[model samples]
Target: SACKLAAAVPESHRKILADIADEVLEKFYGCGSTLPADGSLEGATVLDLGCGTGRDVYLASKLVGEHGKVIGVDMLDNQLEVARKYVEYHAEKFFGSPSRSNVRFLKGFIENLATAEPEGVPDSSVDIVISNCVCNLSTNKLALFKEIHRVLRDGGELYFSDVYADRRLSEAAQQDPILYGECLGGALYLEDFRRLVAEAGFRDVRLVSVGPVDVSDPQLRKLVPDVQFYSCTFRCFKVATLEATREDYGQSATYLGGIGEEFKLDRFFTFPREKPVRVDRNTAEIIRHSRLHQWFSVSAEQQHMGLFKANDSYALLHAPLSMQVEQLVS
Candidate 1:
C-alpha cells in the first residue's frame, strides 16, 4: 500500500474530504472523486457503485442536499458496517437531522444491482453512478458496466476512477495475489477498457483525467515489466443514439455567465462564466444532456450533418506509445 500514492482530488472538494472522519478517510483508495462541479448533485438521486466505507457517499450526501437521495451498495458486510455506522452521524452533521438524512446502504455485488431492487433500487431511477478503484477488482467487468447503465436514468452519467495499464497483463501476473491486492495485475489495458465501456451501451466515454501509477515495490514491479499502469477517471453517458465517432455539425455554444461556480466540460473545456466557446456536434449534445445545458446556449454555424470519420478515434482512447516507451525505458 505504501507504493500506491493517494489520488489528488480537486481543490473545491478538499474541504469535504477534510470533514470526513480520519478513520474512514484513511481507508480511502480511489483515483479521484468523479463528482462533477456542475451542480448536478443538487436534489438528484445518486448511486455509488462500490462505496467502500462510504467516503464518496458521505461526501455526496452534502452535495445532494436535504431533498436529494444517495444509495451506497457494497458486497462486503464489514465495510458496509463502517459506512452504515456513520449514516445518522453524517446525516446530522450534513443535513442537521437524522430524519433529513437522504442516504441508504445496501449489501450487494456491483455486477448484480437487480438483486437488490424491488426492496431497494428501481430500474432507471438513478441520476448518476460512481465508483472508486473497485471496477478493476470485478471478475466480470462487462457485466459490471452493463448493470450500471441499466440502473441509470436516460442521460444519466457513470463517473468512476480505476486502474488502467498500458498493455494487457499476462494470465500468470493476473493471478498474483499481491498484484491484484495492489490494484495492478487486474488493471485493464486502456484500449480494451474503451471498447468494453462502449459495448456496455455508453456511446461516449470521456476521460476526465489520467496519470501514471508508481509501483515502488521492487519485487512486485518485476512481475509486470512489460506493462505500465495509470489511475484514470472517466465519465460515461447513457445518452442513446450518439455517434460512435466525433462529428462536426457546425455547432457552437456560449456560456451565459451565471452558473455561480466555475465548471469544466472536460480537460480542455473549462468555462470562466460568459465565454463564447466553439464546440463540435458531440460536445454540444453532451452539454445539451448534462447539468450544463441551462448554462449554455447553442447556435447553428451550419446545418446538422451526418457523422464524419474522426482522425484520432483510436488515438483518443489509446495511450501514446511514446509515453509508454518512455516509462519502460526509465
Candidate 2:
C-alpha cells in the first residue's frame, strides 16, 4: 500500500513533467516523457514515434511554425483515437486562430512505418524526429531506427527522450510481466542502443541527459535490487551527407544558422567556440558533391550549395572533420 501510494503520487505528477497544460494532464500516464522544449522545432518538419496522448505532438506543434509540419505515429488505434478526440481542444488552447492545423496523426508502428497508404511525408523530407518514453514499448527497436533512417530527409535529425539501463537485465527480471509493463524488459542496453543506432545508419549519437530514475516505491525498489533508471535525450542527424569531423574539407562547416528560427536567430546556435566546424571525409565529399550547392566557405555565400547525391553503395558515415583550421575545428 505504501509503495502504491508513492508510485501513484510520483507517476500522477509525471504529466506535469510533460509540460502539457494542467487541463491536458488531467488524462495522461506514460512510461516516462518529454518534448524538445528549447525551441528546436521552428520551421522544422517533425515526427513523434510513439505519440501516446499527443502531448508531445501538441507541444511539437507549438515549436514548429506554420511552414513546418508535425506527424504523430502510434501503433495503438485507441491511442491515436484519443489524440484525435482532443485535436480541437489543443487547437483552441494554443492557437489564437482556432488552430495552427499543422499536426497530423498516423496509425502506424515505428518498426514498419510504411503502409498501404502513405502519410504524405516523403522519404528524406523531414527535419527532426522526436519521441518521449515510447521506444521501450516497441517489439523491435532496431527496426524502429531503420525506419527512422528511411523516412528522414538527408540531414534530418532525431531528438528523443527514453528510459535506458546501464547494463542488460537478467531473464527473470526481463521476463516479469509487471517489470516489462513498466518499460523495463524492452529497454536496449545503452551500449547496444548506441551500436544499434550506428547499424541503422546514424553515424553519431550524443547523450543529451542522463539521470537516475527515482525509486520512491519501496516494493518496486525491492523487486529490482540495484536497479536504476535514466531519463536521456539523445540526438542523431539523418545526414545523408554530413561529415564526421569536417576535416575532409580541410575545415569545419560552420553552423551559419538559417536552419530554422532558433538556429538562425540565436547566436548560440552558431557554435559557442566560434571554431571552424570539423566534418568527416564522407560528409565533405557529399557536401562537395551536393545538388543543393554546398556552402563550405565560412564567408557565407549562396553559390551552388553543392551536390549531395547518395551513392547506391552508401558511403560510410562520420568520416572525420578536416584539421586545417584549429580555431574552427568542431
Candidate 3:
C-alpha cells in the first residue's frame, strides 16, 4: 500500500539517480522521499541520519553542488564500509577527477549526535536534516529529534519520513522482533508523534507527503489487520521566532514563483504565484526567516488579534496544488 505512494517521489529526484553508482543507489530502502525541492540545496550543508548505504548521501552530493557538503552517520560499520567505498565514485561522477569527495560516513547511533563517531557535528552548523524510516528504529525518538534540533542552524528544517500507526502497538506486538525490524514495532501513534516533536522544539510541523503502507509479509500482515500505518513525510521549521501556537498579527505574504509556479509550505499553507495570503505570526516568520524568504514578501506586522479560535482554518486557506502535495492512499 505504501509503495503505491512510491510514485509521489518526484521525477527530479529519480532522474538524478541515473548519475549515481547503482551499488549505492539501489541500497536505499526509505519509506518516503526525505529530500527538499530541487535547487534548494545548491550550496547548503546536509546531514543524513541512519544513512544506511548512503543512497541519499550521494543523491544529496549532486544537489549540493561543488561547494556543498554532505555527511552520513550510521551505527553499523558494515553499512558505512559499503558507503565509504563509493565516495570516490560519487566524487568522480559529480566533480570529475577532482575526486575530492564532499561526503563522509560516521558510525554512530541516531539518538546521539553530540558524540557522533569521529566528532560531533558542531551545534547550529547544519542547514537541513533529513532521515528516512530510521526514526521508528531509534529507541528514543524525543532525544533523536532533540539532537536534530540542537545541531540545526536557526531557521533550518527537520524534514524526515517515518512509519506511524493510528494507535499504539500492544506490548506483545512491540516485543516482536520481526515487526521492529520491518519498522512497525515502535511506530508512534499520530498524536503522540506531535507531542514528542513539539517537546523536541520543532513547534510547527508540516506534512510533505503521505501514503498507506502495504504489509506484504503474510504473518506480519495478520498482526496489523486493523492497525493502519502510514509512511509520512513531514517538514518542520526550527525558526526561533515561531511560537508554540499560531498567533495573529494580521500579517500576509505574497509568493513570487521560483522553484515552481506555487509553493506548498505545508498541507494548509499553499502560496500560488503572486497570490498574497493572510497568515499567522508563525507562518509569516517561517516565510521571512527561511530560504522561502527570497520568493515571498511578508507584510509588516499589523494590530494584534490575540489568540485565534480553535477552528484554526481561518488564517490561511488554499487547497494544496495538485502534484504539489502527495497524499497517495492505497
Candidate 4:
C-alpha cells in the first residue's frame, strides 16, 4: 500500500496528493482507474462507484468547486471507515469556498445503487458517475450499469476502468476465489461488455486508454494460462435519444473555445476550436445534451439519412452480433 509514483499522478493534482492522507492513498486502488478531463468536473455532482478509501472520491470532491457534490458508495465497511475519517479533513483543507462539505459516503451494493442502504440515489439525480477498478468486480454488471444510467441526469457521463478479457472466459475458472480476488476471473470479454453497455442503455461505449493486467507470479499464471487480462479505461454517456446506432442527420458542430484548443469526445471524434465538424445525429445529440454543450454549438438535425454507416453500426449488436442495424443495412 505505498503511495503512487510521483509521475503517475496528474500534473494538476501532483501536489494535491501530498495533502491527502497516506492511509487513503495506500488503500485507494485504481490500476485501471482514470480521471475524466479537468474541464468537466467543476460544479458537477460526481459519484464514485465502489469508492474504496475515498482516493478518487476525495480528488473528485476537490475538483468540483464548493457548488459541486461528491458521493461515495461501497459494499465494504472497513475501507469505508478510512474514507469517512478524512471527510471533514478535506472539507477543512478546501476551506474559504462558498460551501463547507461538498462530499458524502453511502453504504451499498454496487449493482443496486438506486436502492442503496440509508436511502436510494433518486432517479436522474447525479451529474456524473466516476468509478475505478470496481465495475469488473461487480457480480451483476448489467444491473450495475443500469443503476448508473438510472441515477444520472440526462446526458450524464460514466468514466471508469477495470480488468477485461481478450475473449469470453471459462465458467469453471470464473469460480476460483483467487482468480476473482486478483481481479481477473470476473472480467467481461470485450465485445460482450459492449453488448452489456448497450443493454444498460448507453448507446455507445468508448475506450479512453488500456494497459496490460500482468500476472508476474509464475505459479499464479497457471490459473488461466490461455487468457490475457487487460485494464481498460472506458467512458460513455446517457441521453434521452435512445436510437441504437449512429445516424447521419447532416448535423455539424463547432467548439466555441475555452476548455481545450480541441475537445475529444471519444477515440473517433474530436472538435477543433471553431472548426466545423459534420457529426452524426447521435454525436450531435450527445454534444448538445452533455457538459460539452456549454462550449459546443451543433447545427440542428437535417434529413435522416438512415444509419451512420461511415462511422460504426448497430449491426454489431445482432446475434452473429445481434439484430439488424437498420433493417435497411440488412
Candidate 5:
C-alpha cells in the first residue's frame, strides 16, 4: 500500500494555493495542514520552523495580508534556496508587489533559534509558531519545543503535524539514514512527545487531527516491524492557566460562527453557528484566554468542581458537536 499523503485541505484554501509555484508544492513534504484555516492570522506575526520549500510560508503570506508577517526558518541551504527563488514571484502574484509580500526566509536549525538572533526571531515575538512534518527530524526534540515556546507571545500557539510512533525505537533503527530521512526513524512516541510539550511549558496540547502513517515499502516494513507510526497534527497554547488534565468549572460555550464558513476546532471538533457546547475547564480556558476568545462566549460561572468524569474528558470533546451536545444535555 502507498504511504498516506497529508490530509486534504478544504477546496477553498486549495484554490488559493493553486497560485503558488509548482516547484514549491512538488517539494513540500509536510504531513498535515499547518496553515490557519480560519484566516485568523491577519496582521499577525507568524513563524514557520523547518519550513521546506516555503509551502506553508507562501500560504501564510496570502492569508496574513500585507500587514501580517511570515518568517520561515530552516537549516538546509538548498531548501531555503528553492523557497527563496519565488519570493518575488509569489509576492507579485499573491500580493500586489514584492514589497507587499510579508514573508522572509532564514537559515537556522529549529532546535536552536538563538543562534539566529538579531538576524533571527526575538523572544516572545511571534503571534503563531507553526511547523509542518519537520519536528521529527530534529536531534533534540525538547529543545525544539523550548524554542517554539520562547519565540511565541504569551498567548501564542504552536500548531503543526509530524509522525508519531506506538513505542520507543531502538537506537539502531534511529540511526538508519534512510529511515530517518523518510521521517520514520526519528518519530517520537506519542506520550513522550506530549510530555515534552508539557515540559516545554505548554499547559495543554490539543490534537488538531490524526491519521495513520504506514511504511509500505517491503524493506522499510521489515526493518521496523515492532513499531507503528501515525501522522498527527497538534495545537498547543502557551496559556499558563490550563491544567494538566481536564477539570470541571461548570463552563459552557456558544459558537458565534463568525470565524469562517469552514472553521473547525479540528477534524473531530467542528464549530457550528450558535451551537451550545459543553467544555471542560481546560477547554473553556483555552477558548477564553486565547485567540479564539472572540469567537466564543464562556459561561461566567467558574466555580471549581474537582476533576471531570472520565467519559466526558478530553476524548469526548473530540466527538461530533451533535453527539457532544446530546451527551452534555443528558
Candidate 6:
C-alpha cells in the first residue's frame, strides 16, 4: 500500500527507515517474516523473486554453501543499485575475509525473468526459489509462476512467505490509504490464491504459519477486523504431472525423520479420497479478523491427479507442500 494514503511520505519517517542498513528496511514494506532459516539450502541455486534491498538474497547466499549460487531480481533501479553494493560484502561476510562468491543481483521483474537472465539458465537450474512478502505486489502472478517453474530444475522446490487475506477487499478499502499502507490492498483471498496458484501449475498448496492482523488504525480496524496474516512457505515440484493437480498420495506421507515436531495430528491434514473438504475453521477465523493472510494447514496429502479438470476449483488446496518447518527443522 502507498504510505500515508497517496500523499508524500514525510522526511521524518523516511529518515527513521534510512537509519537501517543501506535503506533496505525503509524501501521494504512487507507483512510477514522471511523464508525460514532452515530451508535445507546447501549447494542450492536460490532465486529471490523481488530481492528488494538484497536482505533475503544475502541470507540465502549464506544458507546455500559457497558452491551454491543466489540471484536477486528486482525491477527497481535505485533498489538494484542499493542491493548490488552488498553483493561483495555479503560474499565476504558469509563466505570469508578474502571471500568466496555465491550471490548475484539482477534487474528484472518476476513475470519476464528471461529478459533479466538472458544467458538462459537451464530448466530447473535452481534448487529452491525463495521470496519474501513480495508476490502480492506483482500484477501478473500467473506469469511469475510460469517463469519460476521454467527455471527450476526437476525436483526443485519453491519456498516463500507472503501475506494473504480472508476475503477480497471492497473498492473503498482497496482505495483507502490506511488499508494500503498496512499492506492490505494487494492481498489475495485464501481461496483465490489457491485457484491462481493452481492455474499457474503449482500443485499442492500447503499452509505453514498464520497470525491475526492488527489494523491498529483504529477507524479502519473497526470497519474490517477480518484480516489476518499468513506467514507460509509453499513448495512445488517441476514434474510434468505438476501442471495438473496431483492425486491423493494417501499412503501416509511422513516427514523424513529429523523433520518437524513428532508430526502432531494438528500439524497435518489427511485428505482422504472422498467428498469435498472446505477451508478449515481455523483458517476461516484467522482470515475473519486480520488484514493479513493466516497460514492454516500443513502437510496435506499429495495427489498427482494430473491435468486440472474444468471443475477442479480446489486443486491447489490439496497439492504442493505448504507446511511449517519449525519443529521439523528445529
What's the lDDT of the predicted structure labeled candidate 6?
0.55
Tens-place lDDT per residue, model 1, 51-89, is: 878888988888888888899898888898888877777
Residue range 1-330, candidate 5, lDDT tens digits:
212355778565797789989999888877878766776777888899889799889888878877889899988889988998998888775546756678888787888887764377779888888888888888888888988988988777898877777778886888889888888888888778878888989867777666666787867777788666777778898887887877877877777866565347653355577877666777777778778887787786577787665232556754432233234324
Candidate 4 lDDT over residue span 41-119, tens digit each: 7899988888889988888877786789988998888988888888778885577533487888889997887667767
Q: How well does candidate 5 score on lDDT at residue 94?
A: 51
**Which candidate do you rate higher for lDDT, 4 or 5?**
5
Model 6 spans with C-alpha error above 4 angstroms:
1-29, 94-99, 117-122, 175-178, 218-229, 242-266, 269-330
lDDT of 6 by residue, 120-225 (tens): 4456577778777777667777777788878886555666666666567776776677555555666677667777776776654545445444456567765556
Computed on alpha carbons, the lDDT of every model, listed in order, comes to 0.74, 0.56, 0.78, 0.74, 0.76, 0.55
Candidate 2's error at 143, in angstroms? 1.1
Cα TM-score of candidate 6:
0.65
Flag regions of model 3 displaced more than 4 Å: 1-5, 306-330
Candidates 4 and 6, the one with greater lDDT: 4
Q: Which consecutive 10 residues in model 1 have the weakest lDDT in total?
A: 309-318
TM-score of each: 0.88, 0.68, 0.88, 0.86, 0.89, 0.65
**Residue pairs in candidate 5 whose N, alpha carbon or C atoms collide under 3 angstroms:** none
Write down the worst ten-residue block by lDDT for model 5: 320-329
